[PDB]
Amino acid sequence: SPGIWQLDCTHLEGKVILVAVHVASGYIEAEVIPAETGQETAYFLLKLAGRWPVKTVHTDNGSNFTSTTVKAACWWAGIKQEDGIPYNPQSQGVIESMNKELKKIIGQVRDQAEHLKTAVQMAVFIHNHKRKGYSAGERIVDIIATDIQ
Amino acid sequence: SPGIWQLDCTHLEGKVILVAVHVASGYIEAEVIPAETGQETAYFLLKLAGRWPVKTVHTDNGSNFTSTTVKAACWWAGIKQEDGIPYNPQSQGVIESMNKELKKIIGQVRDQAEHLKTAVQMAVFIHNHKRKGYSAGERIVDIIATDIQ
Ligand SMILES: C[N@H+](Cc1ccccc1C(=O)NCC1CCCCC1)Cc1ccc2c(c1C(=O)O)OCO2
Ligand SMILES: C[N@H+](Cc1ccccc1C(=O)NCC1CCCCC1)Cc1ccc2c(c1C(=O)O)OCO2
């Protein structure tokens, strides 16, 4: 559970926002890319796993599950690559709700940046710092620290 | 000190590697950029502060210290921007040592990636996971968790 992350891809402004959610905390990392390719997804996972102890990734679609570049990055970084099949039906809804929340925040900051990627990072900042009581950023740190000890 | 980060800029292959070091842990984030500008530095700090509770940044040089875009990002993200003067002289050496270690790792993985940015992220991963004992990634989590609690 401390090491489990979920990939999520959403669209805005004719661009792609790639998101990794730390399932237990709701903490996120995200990036803007022109389109979701295996190489982009692989690179994003390499970045993520250098930053947090990523043990398992539930991929966002079967193309990234299949992608040999994504598999090579998971091998490199010591990540177990799994499917994202929502055997729990509430998984679909949680991700949907997050995409809607993120897009709403992006709208609230959109005028404060020229480039979409800036607004997305502002949205990541707000999402991770929002107290719900602890923030997602606080919850991820506590979960992993508990796990280390 | 859980909140204190130091910016560091180094060169390789005609490109710039921008590094943020969490001083208390030695944990790092890094990116490759064509050249160090106020705008790239501002964007890097925005990304960083969405991911970790950044209270203070010691900037790497007087141009990023002066930069109005860097100041606007520090304002946006709630970061106190400070100068990077090594009033403690052992600070110069620690960063120089880190740049040489990072470059060493980058050369050990350089053949495993076409693009420099990939090699740099592999080096970030290795650096943060290296046990010296605890790794830098373990230390940063423990430090911040203790601070929340
Ligand atoms: C396309 N190449 C192939 C390659 C080319 C040359 C040497 C080795 C390999 C190779 O397969 N290395 C194993 C891997 C190790 C970790 C992750 C993925 C693969 C890797 C790659 C993937 C994604 C990217 C890249 C790059 C890049 O080459 O820089 O740059 C930005 O997003
Ligand atoms: C240069 N612009 C000016 C701007 C343009 C339009 C609206 C507001 C502003 C504005 O100054 N907002 C205040 C901030 C300034 C810095 C950080 C947070 C808020 C911002 C910026 C900085 C660095 C970047 C960017 C961008 C971008 O516009 O996307 O893109 C990649 O690295």
Coordinates of C-alpha atoms and ligand atoms in Angstrom, one line a residue:
Chain A
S1 CA 0.0 0.0 0.0
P2 CA 2.8 2.6 0.8
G3 CA 4.4 1.8 -2.6
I4 CA 1.2 1.7 -4.8
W5 CA 0.6 4.3 -7.5
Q6 CA -2.0 4.7 -10.3
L7 CA -1.4 6.3 -13.7
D8 CA -4.2 8.5 -15.1
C9 CA -4.2 10.4 -18.4
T10 CA -6.6 13.3 -19.0
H11 CA -7.0 15.9 -21.8
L12 CA -7.1 19.7 -21.8
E13 CA -6.5 22.4 -24.5
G14 CA -5.7 19.7 -27.1
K15 CA -2.9 18.4 -24.9
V16 CA -2.4 15.5 -22.5
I17 CA -2.0 15.7 -18.7
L18 CA -0.3 12.6 -17.4
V19 CA -0.9 12.0 -13.6
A20 CA 0.4 9.6 -11.1
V21 CA -1.7 9.2 -7.9
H22 CA -0.4 7.7 -4.7
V23 CA -3.4 5.7 -4.0
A24 CA -3.3 5.6 -0.1
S25 CA -2.9 9.4 0.2
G26 CA -4.3 11.0 -2.9
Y27 CA -1.0 12.8 -3.4
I28 CA -0.2 13.5 -7.1
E29 CA 2.5 14.3 -9.6
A30 CA 1.6 15.4 -13.1
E31 CA 3.1 16.6 -16.3
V32 CA 1.8 18.1 -19.7
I33 CA 2.9 16.1 -22.8
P34 CA 1.7 16.6 -26.5
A35 CA 0.4 13.0 -26.5
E36 CA 0.6 9.9 -24.4
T37 CA 3.3 7.7 -25.9
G38 CA 5.3 4.8 -24.3
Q39 CA 8.5 6.9 -24.3
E40 CA 6.8 9.8 -22.4
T41 CA 5.1 7.4 -20.0
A42 CA 8.4 5.6 -19.4
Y43 CA 10.3 8.9 -18.7
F44 CA 7.6 10.1 -16.3
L45 CA 7.8 6.8 -14.3
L46 CA 11.6 7.0 -14.1
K47 CA 11.2 10.6 -12.7
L48 CA 8.6 9.5 -10.2
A49 CA 10.5 6.4 -9.0
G50 CA 13.7 8.5 -8.4
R51 CA 11.6 10.7 -6.0
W52 CA 9.3 8.3 -4.1
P53 CA 9.7 4.6 -3.3
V54 CA 7.5 3.4 -6.1
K55 CA 6.8 -0.4 -5.7
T56 CA 3.8 -0.9 -7.9
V57 CA 2.2 1.0 -10.8
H58 CA -1.3 0.4 -12.0
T59 CA -1.0 1.5 -15.7
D60 CA -3.7 3.7 -17.2
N61 CA -4.5 1.7 -20.4
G62 CA -3.5 -1.5 -22.2
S63 CA -1.1 0.3 -24.6
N64 CA 1.1 1.5 -21.7
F65 CA 0.7 -1.9 -20.1
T66 CA 2.0 -3.5 -23.4
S67 CA 4.6 -0.8 -24.2
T68 CA 8.1 -2.3 -24.2
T69 CA 9.6 1.1 -23.3
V70 CA 7.2 1.3 -20.3
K71 CA 8.2 -2.2 -19.3
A72 CA 11.9 -1.4 -19.7
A73 CA 11.5 1.7 -17.4
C74 CA 9.6 -0.4 -14.8
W75 CA 12.4 -3.0 -14.9
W76 CA 15.1 -0.2 -14.6
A77 CA 13.4 1.4 -11.7
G78 CA 12.4 -1.7 -9.8
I79 CA 8.6 -1.1 -10.3
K80 CA 6.1 -4.0 -10.6
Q81 CA 3.9 -3.0 -13.6
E82 CA 0.3 -4.0 -13.2
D83 CA -2.9 -3.5 -15.1
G84 CA -5.4 -0.8 -14.0
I85 CA -8.4 -3.0 -14.1
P86 CA -10.8 -1.6 -11.6
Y87 CA -11.8 -4.9 -9.9
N88 CA -13.0 -2.4 -7.3
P89 CA -15.8 -0.4 -9.1
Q90 CA -15.1 2.6 -6.9
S91 CA -11.7 3.1 -8.5
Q92 CA -13.3 4.5 -11.8
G93 CA -15.2 7.1 -9.8
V94 CA -12.3 8.3 -7.6
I95 CA -10.1 8.9 -10.7
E96 CA -13.0 10.6 -12.5
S97 CA -13.6 12.8 -9.5
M98 CA -9.9 13.7 -9.4
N99 CA -9.7 14.7 -13.0
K100 CA -12.7 16.9 -12.5
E101 CA -11.2 18.5 -9.4
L102 CA -7.8 19.0 -11.1
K103 CA -9.5 20.6 -14.1
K104 CA -11.5 22.9 -11.9
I105 CA -8.3 24.1 -10.1
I106 CA -6.6 24.5 -13.4
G107 CA -9.5 26.8 -14.4
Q108 CA -9.1 28.8 -11.2
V109 CA -5.4 29.4 -11.9
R110 CA -5.5 29.4 -15.7
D111 CA -5.1 33.2 -16.1
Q112 CA -2.0 33.3 -13.9
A113 CA 0.2 31.5 -16.5
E114 CA 0.6 31.7 -20.3
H115 CA 1.5 28.0 -20.6
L116 CA -0.7 25.1 -19.7
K117 CA 2.2 23.2 -18.0
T118 CA 2.5 26.1 -15.4
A119 CA -1.2 26.0 -14.5
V120 CA -0.9 22.3 -14.1
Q121 CA 2.0 22.6 -11.6
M122 CA 0.0 25.3 -9.7
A123 CA -2.9 22.8 -9.6
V124 CA -0.6 20.0 -8.4
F125 CA 0.6 22.4 -5.6
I126 CA -3.0 23.4 -4.5
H127 CA -4.2 19.7 -4.7
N128 CA -1.3 18.4 -2.6
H129 CA -1.5 21.2 0.0
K130 CA -5.3 21.1 0.5
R131 CA -6.2 19.9 4.1
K132 CA -9.1 17.5 4.2
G133 CA -7.2 17.1 9.0
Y134 CA -4.1 16.5 6.9
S135 CA -3.1 17.3 3.3
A136 CA -2.3 14.6 0.8
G137 CA 1.4 15.8 1.0
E138 CA 1.3 15.2 4.7
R139 CA -0.4 11.8 4.4
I140 CA 2.1 10.4 1.8
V141 CA 5.1 11.4 4.0
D142 CA 3.5 9.9 7.2
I143 CA 2.6 6.7 5.3
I144 CA 6.1 6.1 3.9
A145 CA 7.9 7.1 7.2
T146 CA 5.7 4.7 9.1
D147 CA 6.7 2.1 6.5
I148 CA 10.4 2.8 6.8
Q149 CA 10.3 2.5 10.7
Chain B
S1 CA 15.7 22.9 8.4
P2 CA 13.1 20.3 7.2
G3 CA 12.1 23.1 4.8
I4 CA 15.5 24.2 3.5
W5 CA 16.6 23.6 -0.1
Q6 CA 19.6 24.8 -2.1
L7 CA 19.7 25.4 -5.8
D8 CA 22.7 24.2 -7.8
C9 CA 23.5 24.5 -11.5
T10 CA 26.1 22.4 -13.3
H11 CA 27.0 21.7 -17.0
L12 CA 27.3 18.7 -19.2
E13 CA 27.3 18.1 -22.9
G14 CA 26.7 21.8 -23.6
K15 CA 23.5 21.6 -21.5
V16 CA 22.6 22.7 -18.0
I17 CA 21.5 20.5 -15.1
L18 CA 19.5 22.3 -12.6
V19 CA 19.5 20.6 -9.1
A20 CA 17.6 21.3 -5.9
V21 CA 19.2 19.7 -2.8
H22 CA 17.3 19.2 0.4
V23 CA 20.2 20.3 2.7
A24 CA 19.4 18.1 5.8
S25 CA 19.0 14.8 3.8
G26 CA 21.1 15.2 0.7
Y27 CA 18.0 14.2 -1.3
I28 CA 17.9 15.8 -4.8
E29 CA 15.6 16.7 -7.7
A30 CA 17.1 17.6 -11.0
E31 CA 16.2 18.5 -14.6
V32 CA 18.0 19.2 -17.9
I33 CA 17.5 22.7 -19.5
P34 CA 19.1 24.3 -22.5
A35 CA 20.3 27.2 -20.4
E36 CA 19.6 28.6 -16.9
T37 CA 17.0 31.4 -17.2
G38 CA 14.8 33.0 -14.6
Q39 CA 11.7 31.4 -16.2
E40 CA 13.2 27.8 -16.2
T41 CA 14.3 28.3 -12.6
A42 CA 10.9 29.7 -11.6
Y43 CA 9.1 26.7 -13.2
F44 CA 11.5 24.2 -11.5
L45 CA 10.8 25.7 -8.1
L46 CA 7.0 25.6 -8.7
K47 CA 7.3 21.9 -9.5
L48 CA 9.5 21.3 -6.5
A49 CA 7.2 23.1 -4.0
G50 CA 4.1 21.2 -5.2
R51 CA 5.9 18.0 -4.3
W52 CA 7.7 18.8 -1.0
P53 CA 7.1 21.4 1.8
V54 CA 9.7 24.0 0.6
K55 CA 10.0 26.8 3.1
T56 CA 13.3 28.3 2.1
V57 CA 15.4 28.2 -1.1
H58 CA 19.0 29.3 -1.2
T59 CA 19.4 30.4 -4.8
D60 CA 22.5 29.3 -6.8
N61 CA 23.6 32.8 -8.1
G62 CA 22.7 36.5 -8.0
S63 CA 20.9 36.4 -11.3
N64 CA 18.3 33.9 -10.0
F65 CA 18.3 35.8 -6.7
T66 CA 17.5 39.1 -8.6
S67 CA 15.1 37.5 -11.2
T68 CA 11.6 38.9 -11.0
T69 CA 10.2 35.6 -12.4
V70 CA 12.0 33.6 -9.8
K71 CA 10.7 36.0 -7.1
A72 CA 7.1 35.7 -8.5
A73 CA 7.3 31.9 -8.3
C74 CA 8.7 32.0 -4.7
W75 CA 5.8 34.4 -3.8
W76 CA 3.3 32.1 -5.6
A77 CA 4.5 28.9 -3.9
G78 CA 5.1 30.5 -0.4
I79 CA 8.9 30.1 -0.5
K80 CA 11.3 32.5 1.2
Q81 CA 14.0 33.2 -1.4
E82 CA 17.4 33.7 0.1
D83 CA 20.9 34.2 -1.2
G84 CA 23.3 31.2 -1.5
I85 CA 26.4 32.8 0.1
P86 CA 28.4 30.0 1.8
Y87 CA 28.8 31.8 5.2
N88 CA 29.7 28.3 6.2
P89 CA 32.7 27.6 3.8
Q90 CA 32.1 23.8 3.9
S91 CA 29.0 24.4 1.8
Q92 CA 30.9 25.2 -1.4
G93 CA 32.7 21.8 -1.0
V94 CA 29.6 19.8 -0.3
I95 CA 27.9 21.0 -3.6
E96 CA 31.1 20.6 -5.6
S97 CA 31.4 17.0 -4.2
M98 CA 27.7 16.4 -5.2
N99 CA 28.2 17.7 -8.8
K100 CA 31.2 15.4 -9.2
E101 CA 29.3 12.4 -7.8
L102 CA 26.3 13.1 -9.9
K103 CA 28.5 13.4 -13.0
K104 CA 30.2 10.1 -12.1
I105 CA 26.8 8.4 -11.9
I106 CA 25.7 10.0 -15.1
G107 CA 28.8 8.5 -16.9
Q108 CA 28.0 5.1 -15.4
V109 CA 24.5 5.1 -16.9
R110 CA 25.2 7.3 -19.9
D111 CA 25.1 4.4 -22.4
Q112 CA 21.6 3.3 -21.2
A113 CA 19.8 6.4 -22.6
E114 CA 20.0 8.3 -25.9
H115 CA 19.0 11.6 -24.2
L116 CA 21.0 13.3 -21.4
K117 CA 17.7 14.0 -19.5
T118 CA 17.1 10.2 -19.1
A119 CA 20.6 9.6 -17.8
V120 CA 20.2 12.5 -15.3
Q121 CA 16.9 11.0 -14.0
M122 CA 18.7 7.6 -13.6
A123 CA 21.4 9.4 -11.7
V124 CA 18.8 11.1 -9.4
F125 CA 17.3 7.7 -8.7
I126 CA 20.6 6.0 -7.9
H127 CA 21.7 9.1 -5.7
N128 CA 18.4 9.1 -3.7
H129 CA 18.3 5.3 -3.2
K130 CA 22.0 5.0 -2.2
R131 CA 22.3 3.7 1.4
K132 CA 25.1 5.5 3.4
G133 CA 22.3 3.3 7.3
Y134 CA 19.6 5.1 5.4
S135 CA 19.2 6.6 1.9
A136 CA 18.7 10.3 1.2
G137 CA 15.1 9.4 0.2
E138 CA 14.5 7.7 3.5
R139 CA 16.1 10.6 5.4
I140 CA 14.0 13.3 3.7
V141 CA 10.7 11.4 4.5
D142 CA 11.8 10.8 8.2
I143 CA 12.8 14.5 8.7
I144 CA 9.5 15.9 7.3
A145 CA 7.3 13.2 9.0
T146 CA 9.0 14.1 12.4
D147 CA 8.3 17.8 11.6
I148 CA 4.5 17.2 10.8
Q149 CA 4.4 15.2 14.1
Ligands
LIG1 C1 14.1 5.1 -26.1 N1 15.3 4.8 -25.3 C2 16.0 3.6 -25.8 C3 17.4 3.5 -25.6 C4 18.3 4.2 -26.4 C5 19.6 4.2 -26.2 C6 20.2 3.4 -25.2 C7 19.3 2.7 -24.4 C8 18.0 2.7 -24.6 C9 17.1 1.9 -23.7 O1 16.2 1.2 -24.1 N2 17.3 2.0 -22.3 C10 16.6 1.3 -21.4 C11 15.6 2.1 -20.6 C12 15.9 2.5 -19.4 C13 15.0 3.3 -18.6 C14 13.8 3.7 -19.2 C15 13.5 3.3 -20.5 C16 14.4 2.5 -21.2 C17 15.2 5.0 -23.8 C18 14.3 6.2 -23.5 C19 13.0 6.0 -23.1 C20 12.2 7.1 -22.7 C21 12.7 8.3 -22.9 C22 14.0 8.6 -23.3 C23 14.8 7.5 -23.7 C24 16.2 7.8 -24.1 O2 16.8 6.9 -24.9 O3 16.8 8.8 -23.6 O4 14.3 9.9 -23.4 C25 13.1 10.5 -22.9 O5 12.1 9.5 -22.6
LIG2 C1 6.5 34.3 -17.5 N1 5.0 34.0 -17.1 C2 4.4 35.4 -16.9 C3 2.9 35.4 -16.9 C4 2.2 35.2 -18.1 C5 0.8 35.2 -18.2 C6 0.1 35.3 -17.0 C7 0.8 35.5 -15.8 C8 2.2 35.5 -15.7 C9 2.9 35.6 -14.4 O1 3.8 36.4 -14.3 N2 2.4 34.8 -13.4 C10 3.0 34.9 -12.1 C11 3.9 33.7 -11.9 C12 5.2 33.7 -12.3 C13 6.0 32.6 -12.1 C14 5.5 31.5 -11.4 C15 4.2 31.5 -10.9 C16 3.4 32.6 -11.1 C17 4.8 33.1 -15.9 C18 5.7 31.8 -16.2 C19 6.9 31.7 -15.5 C20 7.7 30.6 -15.7 C21 7.4 29.7 -16.6 C22 6.2 29.8 -17.3 C23 5.3 30.9 -17.1 C24 4.0 31.0 -17.9 O2 3.5 32.1 -18.2 O3 3.5 29.9 -18.2 O4 6.0 28.8 -18.2 C25 7.2 28.0 -17.9 O5 8.1 28.6 -17.0

